[PDB]
Ligand binder design. Structure first.
Ligand SMILES: Nc1ccn([C@H]2C[C@H](O)[C@@H](COP(=O)(O)OP(=O)(O)OP(=O)(O)O)O2)c(=O)n1
Ligand SMILES: [Mg+2]
Ligand SMILES: [Mg+2]
Length: 428
DNA sequence: ATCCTCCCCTAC
DNA sequence: TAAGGTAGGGGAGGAT
């Protein structure tokens, strides 16, 4: 019991063992690598000449499904179909990593705090909190990916995350529904009780939207030609890939608060969209609302090996950071370089460029944030440097990192988060 | 134009 | 209390 503090040599070990976000990142990097290792001698890229169907396949409320299947006996009482269930560490300002669809019927969402969620429950409804079972998440994910491989359906299986894969069938010069059904069935068995939904389309963007539409335990087909207003009407603006909270808020401020993708598509003009959200992103949204992928998104089909090749490496710690003096900070920075250099040597790379980035308490923010041990409201400060030669040397790297911290000049007592980055990685 | 640094955003 | 990580697209503004 009793959490290891940031000035302890084993902070990172203990914090990473508990952070579900760190697992998500680690599992993602490992799946990319596993992809590169398995396809060393496989000719891999899709062409413009190629005709293809995307099957975007994703576990439903993963984590809540798997924590529930693996639950301890003191929750046998529990019932996935009727009870609101979440997976989380605590009881107040503690993130809900995953909630089941009964929880979502009350308005509860994945990154919400437990205290916020319990306000949403009417009288006589009790939130059930399950613990994380990281090993088990990983076992179901393995069963998933081996099951996909074993059916011999796809020309290519792109790992996007621990519970999600984009699968491509190449069609030379009805079936699709049976294939959806087989995949959902075989994954449900190979996994034991877990459910997957499937979006199937001729675009990556439509497949992702079809997936959302399918989503409690179903599949949904939807091609560029099946687009209708009743389809677009069913999606929030941030159901678009690449649109999240800031873009939502900009889209709303520009197009008088459109409430569904349908309302947006009827109101927007390419020009105003670009001026609003960026251009690129605006361009992406534009193409999306016609069912089409932007060029950036497509690189993953036209060259998976490149897109999936890791181009940088870092840690980023924004919880539990509390220091009194620079000695503690320097030692921490040194430990973080030690950790990172073990990773760098494991992937047989060196670095030519480094960044130290930090979160500093805003002038106006309480010294102790509402979230226990949290970073609270902060400003970002970042500085990078080019190394003369690519190296994996501790002395070069740790010294420049401690040097970069002095240049940003954050008093230790104000530090609330810190990131150490190797931008630019050089082979061999 | 283009490139570089310091961010912001999104994903999951 | 509680574990707010991390890769990588992208833009603004200065430097060339
Ligand atoms: N803010 C978030 C979002 C997700 N994850 C974790 C837990 C989720 O179970 C898993 C996969 O994330 P998804 O976005 O796919 O969401 P779910 O699988 O939970 O729900 P859905 O049925 O909407 O796919 O990643 C998390 O910890 N915090
Ligand atoms: Mg999911
Ligand atoms: Mg997912």
């Amino acid at each position: 019991k009793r959490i290891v503090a940031c000035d302890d040599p084993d902070f990172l070990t203990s914090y990473f063992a508990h952070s579900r976000l760190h697992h998500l990142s680690a599992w993602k990097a490992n799946l990319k690598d596993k992809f590169l290792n398995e396809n060393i001698h496989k000719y891999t890229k899709i062409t413009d000449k190629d005709t293809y169907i995307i099957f975007h396949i994703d576990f439903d409320c993963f984590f809540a499904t798997v924590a529930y299947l693996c639950r301890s006996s003191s929750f046998s009482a529990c019932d996935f179909k009727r009870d609101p269930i979440v997976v989380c560490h605590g009881t107040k300002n503690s993130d809900i990593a995953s909630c089941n669809y009964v929880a979502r019927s009350y308005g509860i969402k994945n990154g919400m705090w437990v205290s916020q969620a319990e306000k949403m429950l009417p009288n006589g409804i009790k939130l059930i909190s399950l613990p994380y079972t990281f090993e088990q998440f990983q076992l179901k994910s393995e069963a998933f990916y081996s099951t996909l491989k074993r059916l011999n359906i796809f020309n290519l299986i792109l790992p996007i995350s621990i519970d999600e894969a984009v699968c491509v069938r190449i069609i030379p010069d009805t079936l699709n529904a049976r294939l959806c059904e087989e995949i959902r069935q075989e994954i449900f068995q190979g996994t034991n009780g877990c459910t997957v939904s499937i979006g199937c389309s001729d675009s990556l963007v439509l497949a992702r939207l079809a997936l959302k539409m399918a989503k409690p335990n179903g599949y949904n087909i939807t091609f560029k030609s099946n687009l209708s207003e009743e389809f677009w009407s069913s999606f929030k603006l941030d159901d678009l890939p690449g649109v999240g909270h800031s873009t939502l808020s900009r889209l709303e401020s520009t197009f008088d608060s459109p409430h569904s993708l349908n309302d947006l598509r009827k109101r927007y003009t390419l020009d105003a969209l670009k001026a609003s959200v960026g251009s690129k992103l605006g361009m992406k949204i534009h193409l999306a609302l016609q069912g089409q992928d932007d060029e950036e998104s497509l690189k993953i089909l036209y060259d998976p090996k490149e897109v999936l090749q890791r181009k940088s490496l870092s840690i980023d710690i924004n919880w539990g950071i509390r220091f009194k003096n620079i000695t503690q900070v320097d030692l921490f920075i040194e430990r973080g370089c030690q950790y990172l250099l073990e990773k760098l040597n494991e992937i047989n790379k060196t670095t030519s460029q480094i960044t130290l980035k930090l979160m500093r308490r805003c002038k106006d923010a309480p010294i102790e944030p509402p979230k226990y041990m949290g970073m609270g409201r902060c400003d970002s400060f970042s500085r990078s440097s080019r190394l003369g030669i690519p190296t994996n040397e501790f002395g070069i790297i740790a010294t420049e990192m401690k040097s970069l911290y002095r240049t940003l000049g954050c008093p230790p007592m104000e530090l609330r988060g810190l990131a150490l980055q190797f931008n630019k990685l050089v082979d061999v």
